[PDB]
Design a protein around this ligand. Structure first.
Ligand SMILES: [Cl-]
Length: 216
């Protein structure tokens, strides 16, 4: 009960995420967008933050994956669950309990290579360009906690970012996308070519993609 032909309004995807929302887990919503830009040229590489008016949810429980001291830095940041390969294994074991995952570059080769089949479809997979991956584990642990998200230029000019969860009532979820969008829009360079937002798409684990009208 999804139409490939159809282009969806921000509201229409929003209600459609809930239709398809399963109760076995609360799914993070993500907006994906093709930015008309050329990442090759450095001037349109887009970097910017926005505060989702309702955030990622209010009691955001964070899983930090890291090595070294940055593990302590991560539980002194106030992370609800910290760890290392033990933590990965406790996921493969089948433990999904967290609302968010963040990580240092250091472990990403392992987290990327192992957790990808599991975290990714649920929008729990750390990405540096979602501002969930970095050596400053402290800021990310708080910013994500503070509900602030930062987009970064993908290599092909994609962008992703968590917009919140499928349990959100849909109007509250709509406000998030337009918000992220509005702050996404703000960052177009001056010498950019045709329309800044080429394609934008809503996703969850049950809606592999919708294409939306970002101005609706
Ligand atoms: Cl179901």
């Amino acid at each position: 009960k999804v139409d490939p032909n159809k282009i969806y309004t921000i509201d229409e995807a929003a209600h459609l995420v809930k239709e398809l929302a399963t109760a076995k887990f609360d799914e993070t919503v993500e907006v994906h967008a093709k930015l008309g830009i050329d990442p090759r040229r450095s001037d349109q590489n887009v970097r910017g933050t926005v505060s989702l008016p309702h955030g990622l949810g209010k009691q955001v429980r964070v899983l930090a994956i890291a090595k070294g001291e940055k593990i302590k830095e991560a539980e002194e940041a106030g992370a609800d669950y910290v760890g290392g390969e033990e933590i990965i294994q406790k996921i493969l074991d089948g433990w999904m309990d967290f609302d968010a995952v963040v990580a240092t570059p250091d472990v990403m080769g392992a987290v990327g290579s192992k957790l990808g089949r599991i975290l990714g479809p649920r929008g729990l997979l750390p990405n540096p360009k979602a501002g969930t991956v970095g050596f400053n584990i402290g800021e990310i642990i708080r910013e994500i906690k503070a509900g602030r998200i930062e987009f970064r230029n993908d290599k092909t000019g994609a962008i992703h970012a968590p917009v919140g969860k499928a349990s959100f009532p849909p109007e509250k979820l709509a406000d998030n996308i337009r918000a992220f969008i509005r702050a996404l829009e703000a960052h177009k360079p001056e010498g950019a070519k045709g329309t800044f937002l080429r394609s934008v798409y809503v996703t969850t684990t049950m809606v592999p993609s919708v294409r939306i009208n970002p101005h609706s």
